[PDB]
Amino acid sequence: APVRSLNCTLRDSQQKSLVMSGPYELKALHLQGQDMEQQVVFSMSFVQGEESNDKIPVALGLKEKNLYLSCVLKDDKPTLQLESVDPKNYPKKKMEKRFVFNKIEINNKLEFESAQFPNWYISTSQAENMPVFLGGTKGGQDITDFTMQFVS
Ligand SMILES: Cn1ccc(C(=O)NC[C@@H]2CCCO2)n1
């Protein structure tokens, strides 16, 4: 039938929120109070792909926008971008692989592994107001763990 989706926000494990600074830019910063209205709301779709008890394939679109997180090669490294799509055709159950993330439950948080690029994860920096990016380890100094808030 039709792909199922949920509206949500994400916070990294240092409790930074995500905000849209540009058509193709997401940043992470500490936020509280009225300024939380600035956070990005995602539509998380539950898409086709390999699934296990703790690992579920999803796509992450911006709520009511034809923009999705996707993973592509840039300068011979997996990179994260926002990509526009035809709004008549998305979301769909069979999302192209570059749009798919394995949502992994680990230690009461979530990680988002690229389905296209194994062991590359949606990441944030510890510094304030830096771009979200794809980080090719869950060990060192990038933040790869998140919590989800489910939104009306
Ligand atoms: C205009 N600008 C400067 C830096 C960036 C950037 O890194 N964009 C990518 C991130 C990953 C997902 C969307 O934003 N864009």
Curated annotation (Swiss-Prot):
Annotated site residue numbers, Involved in receptor binding: R4
Example GO molecular function: protein domain specific binding
Keyword Secreted tagged: yes
Effect in UniProt of substituting E25N: Requires 2 nucleotide substitutions
Activity regulation, short description: (Microbial infection) Cleavage by S.pyogenes cysteine protease SpeB promotes its activation independently of CASP1. SpeB-mediated maturation of IL1B plays a dual role depending on infection site: while IL1B inflammatory response prevents bacterial growth during invasive skin infections, it promotes streptococcal infection of the nasopharynx by disrupting colonization resistance mediated by the microbiota.
Conditions for induction: By LPS. Transcription and translation induced by M.tuberculosis and a number of different M.tuberculosis components in macrophages; EsxA is the most potent activator tested (at protein level). In pancreatic islets, release is increased by high glucose treatment. In pancreatic islets and macrophages, release is also increased by endocannabinoid anandamide/AEA.
CC terms in the record's Gene Ontology section: cytosol; extracellular region; extracellular space; lysosome; secretory granule
Primary localisation category: cytoplasm
Tissue/organ expression: Expressed in activated monocytes/macrophages (at protein level).
Protein keywords: Cytokine, Cytoplasm, Inflammatory response, Lysosome, Mitogen, Pyrogen, Secreted
Motif (Involved in interaction with TMED10 C-terminus): 112-125
Location relative to the cell: Cytoplasm, Cytosol; Secreted; Lysosome; Secreted, Extracellular exosome
Effect of K88E: Suppression of integrin binding. Markedly reduced activity. Markedly reduced activity
Record annotation: effect of changing K65E: Suppression of integrin binding. Markedly reduced activity
Site (Important for interaction with integrin): K55, K63, K65, K74, K88
Post-translational note: Activation of the IL1B precursor involves a CASP1-catalyzed proteolytic cleavage. Processing and secretion are temporarily associated. (Microbial infection) Cleavage by S.pyogenes cysteine protease SpeB promotes its activation independently of CASP1.
Primary role: Potent pro-inflammatory cytokine. Initially discovered as the major endogenous pyrogen, induces prostaglandin synthesis, neutrophil influx and activation, T-cell activation and cytokine production, B-cell activation and antibody production, and fibroblast proliferation and collagen production. Promotes Th17 differentiation of T-cells. Synergizes with IL12/interleukin-12 to induce IFNG synthesis from T-helper 1 (Th1) cells. Plays a role in angiogenesis by inducing VEGF production synergistically with TNF and IL6.
Subunit structure of this chain's protein: Monomer. In its precursor form, weakly interacts with full-length MEFV; the mature cytokine does not interact at all. Interacts with integrins ITGAV:ITGBV and ITGA5:ITGB1; integrin-binding is required for IL1B signaling. Interacts with cargo receptor TMED10; the interaction is direct and is required for the secretion of IL1B mature form. Interacts with HSP90AB1; the interaction facilitates cargo translocation into the ERGIC. Interacts with HSP90B1; the interaction facilitates cargo translocation into the ERGIC.
Similarity section: Belongs to the IL-1 family.
Other noteworthy facts: The IL1B production occurs in 2 steps, each being controlled by different stimuli. First, inflammatory signals, such as LPS, stimulate the synthesis and promote the accumulation of cytosolic stores of pro-IL1B (priming). Then additional signals are required for inflammasome assembly, leading to CASP1 activation, pro-IL1B processing and eventually secretion of the active cytokine. IL1B processing and secretion are temporarily associated.
Name used for this protein in its record: Interleukin-1 beta
Naturally occurring in which organism (per UniProt): Homo sapiens (Human)
Gene: IL1B
